[PDB]
Amino acid sequence: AYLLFYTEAKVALAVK
Amino acid sequence: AYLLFYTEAKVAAAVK
Amino acid sequence: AYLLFYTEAKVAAAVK
Amino acid sequence: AYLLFYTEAKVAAAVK
Amino acid sequence: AYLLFYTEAKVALAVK
Amino acid sequence: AYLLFYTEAKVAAAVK
Amino acid sequence: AYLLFYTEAKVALAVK
Amino acid sequence: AYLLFYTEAKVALAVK
Amino acid sequence: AYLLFYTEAKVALAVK
Amino acid sequence: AYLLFYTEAKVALAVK
Amino acid sequence: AYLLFYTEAKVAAAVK
Amino acid sequence: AYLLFYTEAKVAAAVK
Numbered sequence: 521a522y523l524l525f526y527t528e529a530k531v532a533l534a535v536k
Numbered sequence: 537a538y539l540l541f542y543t544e545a546k547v548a549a550a551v552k
Numbered sequence: 553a554y555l556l557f558y559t560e561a562k563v564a565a566a567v568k
Numbered sequence: 569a570y571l572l573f574y575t576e577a578k579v580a581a582a583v584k
Numbered sequence: 585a586y587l588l589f590y591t592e593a594k595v596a597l598a599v600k
Numbered sequence: 601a602y603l604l605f606y607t608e609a610k611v612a613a614a615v616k
Numbered sequence: 617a618y619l620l621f622y623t624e625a626k627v628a629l630a631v632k
Numbered sequence: 633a634y635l636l637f638y639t640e641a642k643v644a645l646a647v648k
Numbered sequence: 649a650y651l652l653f654y655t656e657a658k659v660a661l662a663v664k
Numbered sequence: 665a666y667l668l669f670y671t672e673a674k675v676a677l678a679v680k
Numbered sequence: 681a682y683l684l685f686y687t688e689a690k691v692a693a694a695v696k
Numbered sequence: 697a698y699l700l701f702y703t704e705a706k707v708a709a710a711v712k
């Protein structure tokens with residue numbers, strides 16, 4: 521799975 | 537300091 | 553899903 | 569210390 | 585949106 | 601879009 | 617300046 | 633190409 | 649604590 | 665060694 | 681030093 | 697592909 525930084529505000533590490 | 541993210545929607549960043 | 557960090561204090565992680 | 573990844577499948581993380 | 589490092593060369597942060 | 605960094609005297613960011 | 621991820625809980629990008 | 637952290641376990645910087 | 653990528657090879661995310 | 669993003673403008677990955 | 685990206689077509693990296 | 701690092705300290709990179 522990819523480890524993708526993400527934000528909608530906080531930044532989070534999404535796991536895809 | 538830290539980079540923050542915000543919306544105006546478009547995502548934009550700032551530093552504090 | 554999202555990688556979460558929480559305080560166990562030492563940092564700990566989960567994925568939801 | 570460092571974050572490590574493992575599977576239970578879903579990816580999960582730990583700290584060591 | 586995703587925050588994805590990218591290169592075509594410089595590295596850049598793409599906002600997707 | 602691209603996250604840009606520029607000299608504002610400290611670093612500042614914009615997204616295009 | 618360095619761009620260092622950190623956490624105390626949210627992740628954030630420190631600007632040092 | 634994207635520079636995406638990735639894990640199947642080790643993390644690596646994937647070049648896509 | 650800082651989240652710092654490092655390598656000794658693939659990478660690891662140090663928690664300092 | 666540490667892999668640390670930085671910026672003075674471009675982002676770059678420093679090797680320390 | 682810093683990692684730099686270049687084309688060979690694949691993206692490749694070097695250190696300076 | 698993966699960005700890989702080599703070192704016994706100076707660091708060299710490669711894409712596999």
Ligand SMILES: [Cl-]
Binds near residue numbers: 521522
């Ligand atoms: Cl996968």
Ligand SMILES: [Cl-]
Binds near residue numbers: 537631632
């Ligand atoms: Cl500071």
Ligand SMILES: [Cl-]
Binds near residue numbers: 569663664
């Ligand atoms: Cl430690």
Ligand SMILES: [Cl-]
Binds near residue numbers: 577578
């Ligand atoms: Cl599955």
Ligand SMILES: [Cl-]
Binds near residue numbers: 585586600
């Ligand atoms: Cl989105």
Ligand SMILES: [Cl-]
Binds near residue numbers: 626
């Ligand atoms: Cl917090």
Ligand SMILES: [Cl-]
Binds near residue numbers: 624649650
């Ligand atoms: Cl701390």
Ligand SMILES: [Cl-]
Binds near residue numbers: 648697
């Ligand atoms: Cl591939």
Ligand SMILES: [Cl-]
Binds near residue numbers: 690711712
């Ligand atoms: Cl190759």
